[PDB]
Design a protein around this ligand. Structure first.
Ligand SMILES: *[C@@H]1O[C@H](CO)[C@@H](O[C@@H]2O[C@H](CO)[C@@H](O)[C@H](O)[C@H]2NC(C)=O)[C@H](O)[C@H]1NC(C)=O
Lengths: 48, 48
């Protein structure tokens, strides 16, 4: 049973590629998104 | 005549520091300004 689950295999190739791309985009936006001061737009901070 | 030049010494002290702050802010804005497109806001380019 632990070896039986299909996972993402049953998903179509184009749909699988789309899902992987969307997950990577999500992770990249979360990791490298920054906001900026309203009175000094040349000073912008990451999250962590 | 070259040596007798007065320069900005004739200006008031508070106005002198105000002018120096303005010049420094101008230089910093020009040097560190950056822009980026709405397609991928996580890639912003300097000028040079
Ligand atoms: C994982 O996906 C494959 C699909 O290829 C499943 O295989 C099917 O199994 C059913 C049930 O016996 C058959 O009716 C189909 O003919 C099979 N399709 C094939 C071989 O292409 C497999 O069962 C899935 N694993 C699960 C649900 O645990």
């Amino acid at each position: 049973q632990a070896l039986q689950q299909n996972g993402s295999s049953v998903l179509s190739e184009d749909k699988s590629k789309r899902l992987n791309t969307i997950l990577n985009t999500m992770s990249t936006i979360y990791s490298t998104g920054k906001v900026c001061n309203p009175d000094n737009p040349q000073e912008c901070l990451l999250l962590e």
